[PDB]
Amino acid sequence: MWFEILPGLAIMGVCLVIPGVSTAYIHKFTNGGKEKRVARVQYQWYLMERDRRISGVNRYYVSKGLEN
Amino acid sequence: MFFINILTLLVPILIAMAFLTLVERKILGYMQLRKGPNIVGPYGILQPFADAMKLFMKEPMRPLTTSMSLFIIAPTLSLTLALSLWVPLPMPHPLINLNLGILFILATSSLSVYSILWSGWASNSKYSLFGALRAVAQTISYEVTMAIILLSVLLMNGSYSLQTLITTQEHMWLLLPAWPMAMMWFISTLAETNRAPFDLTEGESELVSGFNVEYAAGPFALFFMAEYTNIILMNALTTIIFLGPLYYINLPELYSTNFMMEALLLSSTFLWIRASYPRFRYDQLMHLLWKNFLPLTLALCMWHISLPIFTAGVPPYM
Amino acid sequence: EMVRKCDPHIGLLHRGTEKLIEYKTYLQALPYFDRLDYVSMMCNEQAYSIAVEKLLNIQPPPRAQWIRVLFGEITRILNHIMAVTTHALDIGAMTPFFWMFEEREKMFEFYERVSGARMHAAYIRPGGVHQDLPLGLLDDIYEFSKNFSLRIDEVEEMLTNNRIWRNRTVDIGVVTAEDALNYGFSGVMLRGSGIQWDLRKTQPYDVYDQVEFDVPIGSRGDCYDRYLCRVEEMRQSLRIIEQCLNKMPPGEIKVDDAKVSPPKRAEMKTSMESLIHHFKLYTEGYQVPPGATYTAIEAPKGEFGVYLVSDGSSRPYRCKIKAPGFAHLAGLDKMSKGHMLADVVAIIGTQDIVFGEIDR
Amino acid sequence: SRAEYVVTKLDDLINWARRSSLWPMTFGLACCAVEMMHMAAPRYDMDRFGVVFRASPRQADVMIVAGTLTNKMAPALRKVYDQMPEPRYVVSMGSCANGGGYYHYSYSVVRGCDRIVPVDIYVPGCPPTAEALLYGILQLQRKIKREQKLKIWYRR
Amino acid sequence: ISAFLKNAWAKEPVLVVSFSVWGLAIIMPMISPYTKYASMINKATPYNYPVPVRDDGNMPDVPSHPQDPLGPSLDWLKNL
Amino acid sequence: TYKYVNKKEQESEVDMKSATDNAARILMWTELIRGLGMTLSYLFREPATINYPFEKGPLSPRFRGEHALRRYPSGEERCIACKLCEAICPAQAITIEAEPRADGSRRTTRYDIDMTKCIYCGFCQEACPVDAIVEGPNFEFSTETHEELLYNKEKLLNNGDKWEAEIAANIQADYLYR
Amino acid sequence: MNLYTVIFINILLSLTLILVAFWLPQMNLYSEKANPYECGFDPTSSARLPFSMKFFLVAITFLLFDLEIALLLPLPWAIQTIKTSTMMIMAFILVTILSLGLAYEWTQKGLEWTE
Amino acid sequence: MNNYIFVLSSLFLVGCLGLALKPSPIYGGLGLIVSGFVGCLMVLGFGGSFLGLMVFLIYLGGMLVVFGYTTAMATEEYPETWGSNWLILGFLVLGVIMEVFLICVLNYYDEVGVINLDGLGDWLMYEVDDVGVMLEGGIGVAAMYSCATWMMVVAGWSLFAGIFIIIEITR
Ligand SMILES: CCCCCCCCCCCCCCCCCC(=O)OC[C@H](COP(=O)(O)OCCN)OC(=O)CCCCCCCCCCCCCCCCC
Ligand code: SF4
């Protein structure tokens, strides 16, 4: 019956969910719990590099607020 | 860590393709009133693995007349390109965020054809030549309108970036504004993946097998692996461009899962069509496209240049 | 990729059947005929039986005639399913083949139930038939027939109006009426291009002159027209099967001349003369009076004929088989002028050629 | 147990892979081709056992020689058999191929395909029924199962 | 030409649609209130820096502070 | 009696509704959608396949399969060297070499059937006047080696012993027709 | 560096699969197996001889149309202009000229394959 | 990375050298595909993007049509590769070594000049607008729709006339 088709489709669905979820999780993990800052313009690149120098750890995701 | 992300993006995609093969066989069987693979492992799950092991354990032919360099290079290029094209796709966060992602997709897809062309020419066999020069016409057909269709749809997106389409479709599918284009794009994907009703480069009935006639074993298996990965890829591109999933910055998992659902739907529709329709002739395909889609496609591109102006709805840049 | 010349090379499946037959009695040659057109078996052996009956100057019994017409129609359905579905499979469409081969299997079940073999029955024998229909076979035939129409209509809803199919067939393999007649075409290769000819109507055999059935004729003369013609022929075959089922008569099944057809086993076991007849029939065989004839039937493909020459022995002197498709595959070149390789692949299907018959 | 146990299970795996996906070749010569079609038909779906037809001899596994093999056709049959890639098998189906069959005493018939190519399974009949052919294919699968190439290599 | 147009509509619908859409693509931009606003919006978008200009004491319209009433106002864009 | 299968009849009928219907047909792919619907309808129907190894399909009593030689209830080979079976076998697969017995009886000492030459036609089982040679229900006797398909009197008689029940049933249920 | 890394990884994966496919299987090479394929019979002629292309005209026309595609692909950034009227007029002229060229070729039978 | 751009340019030179040696048109097309890819990469590394991708696209299309033409007209019973002809092979190696030696010679005679292998990669990019936004080459190219409409007019006319010219040459 058509139900017997659906095991393979379920395997597919899992195998195609993993890419996106894994990418999001790993991007968040490796960018300080925040999604990767996209640099689609020199302005964004400059902002990221300023954060990199300001943080003092050479990391753009590490954020210094009013305290600094 | 980036390597771990690469693994998570490759291995699942390859497995999904492996089981696309099984799903195709079972769906076709059921639609044709038979059951399909269901004896090799529970419910036939192990059929793709058995097939891959057999193909990679069979002797790879090296026919005397062939040109070894190209005859070996082409399958590698096919699989490499099909896998690479999965790189920039947002789901919702692309592994690689490219500003001109759409042009990158077009470049990679276009270079894909050279796998078929070179393999066919290198086989040094008459059926190989037939297949290669049919693929040439297939490209001459789809490539003219694919670029225009993408231009027209992106004329509501404002930039070639894929990720921008996530926001574009925040409150609505792009299908509704451009359903006329969605259909032409769907047929163009059907042609590009070289699948029925447009599987004329490997049509068993006319050419014993096309470009891949002289290929055997693992070198052969690479071609089919790339073919099915490309099916999944193109339907993913359709799902992202049209039929936009639900994106909320709070949960990317929703986007991922909804995208999976829609991509499976379209991939199933590919096999649905394969089992439902005959095969175009390789001049009828070119006639179809050039004399039906292109006249309409140019008009639609004109109209979608006009729309942002006379509706004062220019897409934002950035 | 345009076909500038077609040179059909055949003989790759020629096994000298015409010479082999000359060495075997008239009963011992019948199985060959079931293999000349392995797709439509009972019609070939019907041609043989009619020829041998003509020479013997004997007449089949009424029940045998009706049974032969019924199973001839079933065989015509089998042939048309094979032609249409293989043609579609080669053109591209694949599902109708699987859909229809289930019904082919059911018809094979009928074949086996009556004759003990799913094909190559050897059921039709000069004189009538080997055995009478096992009880219930008419009921099963009714159950199958009442439903086959819906399955053919599904295949039609798939193929008839599809633009892809119409583009892939229409105005392909166009053959003019005069050219076809000159080339020697037959059957649908003739009726497709407007020629009003069908031996079952013009020169009836068996009981084809008591059952009403129309003869589809095409106007354009192309592959699409001939595909429609074959489908309509299947429908008319269903019509004829209905009439045969309703008018199946009672009585014997094989000519009651024990010097031609074997006597029943009980008679063999309790009658001296009957035992002698059994012995000589299954050793020496009948002695067909000297003569010559050319019997023709409207086989599911075309005009299957046998030119049989007998010199009074129990073995034929010469048995030329006129296969319907010989002239067709001869006219392939004329049909394929100015067509691509794909069009040619389409053209070969319309001919509906079985190289068993082509090679003989 | 021992490393040779690893070898034994490894060729078990090889045999499983080869037997569970033997792609035949489209090579219907005569009547018996119709019965092979009926094999593929829904009722006895050969696909269910992993069996799928592929036209390319370079991409086929088993050759199902089905029908009369005439002298004219013999060179082509041998050519394609030679062209098939190595781990290849040959199943003869029908009397025409098993032996001469109805045309044994004929000038233009190869009295059996064993003369031209080595035969691994014979399927009797005329035609052999599709159920019989499926049973024969399963028997070929058993033959593959009992292989032991790698164990032979180790004990070499 | 009613007859030829009616026939074309059925026997070559693709070209009828294409020519009609092209004709509309030309006609509509001229016939539409909103067309003027596209160039105004693209001029409103401030990609570069607004360079201050030295106040010679006789510049009466340009403001001194961004929040002063004088100067261009994007109320029209806000409620387009 | 003939019926046109594809003759175009009345042509002048052009209408606005007809034209928009035709344009919709061409542009929207109506007939293609309909074919797709048919395929799905089949998708949702019970398959017609059968798990063959544990579910053989039907076969009638007339089915012709592997040969066998029957015995009388006393246990005696019915084969009386008729020789008609050998005379009638169209493919000439039967070979009989018979000699008188020590009991003053007619029997066969070499009964060979070449099952790579037989055409499974039933002429032997119908020309046997004592119902010795029969074609039993078995249809699965594929062998790996050719020489195992050249049968002999022994193998035939053991097949008869093995299948005597089913052969008996088929003959019982069919003899009235024969 | 990420794009280079991932593309090289894809290349290496494909090449590794090929090498495994060529060094794992047991082989037997002989002339009849190696000789080319042509439906079971020997090649009547080599496949390197000229093969007429019946769509040469459309093939060339593809070149020019693809360059038109190139000329049009800047439109997404063009629309971010201030001279919207000029951009509209120019794009309309370009596409209309494209359409006229295609229409002339069609009416002149350019797209009909050459026999 | 220091040698990134120089390596890409050298690969471009080698691909162009192969094309100049002129093997069979199939290998010529393959070589030009590789050269077009490398050139696109050089443009990308020089801050470009749209231009590199456009060259790659148009060149893929062009070589597709060219290959189709070669299989039909520019063909031989035994196509000659780079290695097949011993003269081609020898001059391929000679050209490679000659370019290497010429690089060394120019570096030695002019320590800083056309080539500065020492200090290589120190002058790839000169200036960048750090805090800009609209600096993408697509903008410059799209300028043809506003400030350089004459360019568009001439190019569009060229393609239009190309249609008629090609049809009448192939008549
Ligand atoms: C408000 C102001 C603005 C108004 C603007 C109005 C715009 C209206 C636009 C309406 C037109 C919609 C676009 C339709 C594109 C189809 C083009 C066409 O007309 O059909 C061509 C062809 C039919 O074949 P043929 O008969 O030869 O047509 C030419 C006859 N001389 O058709 C074909 O190619 C069919 C052959 C290929 C079949 C492929 C199989 C597809 C199976 C069905 C897919 C259905 C789902 C597609 C959607 C996917 C979405 C992801
Ligand atoms: S064995 Fe019998 S059924 Fe099979 S091809 Fe030969 S004659 Fe036909």
Ligand code: SF4
């Ligand atoms: S098989 Fe029958 S006819 Fe033949 S010898 Fe035996 S008993 Fe007599």
Ligand code: SF4
């Ligand atoms: S079934 Fe026919 S061919 Fe076979 S042994 Fe009996 S008589 Fe001979």
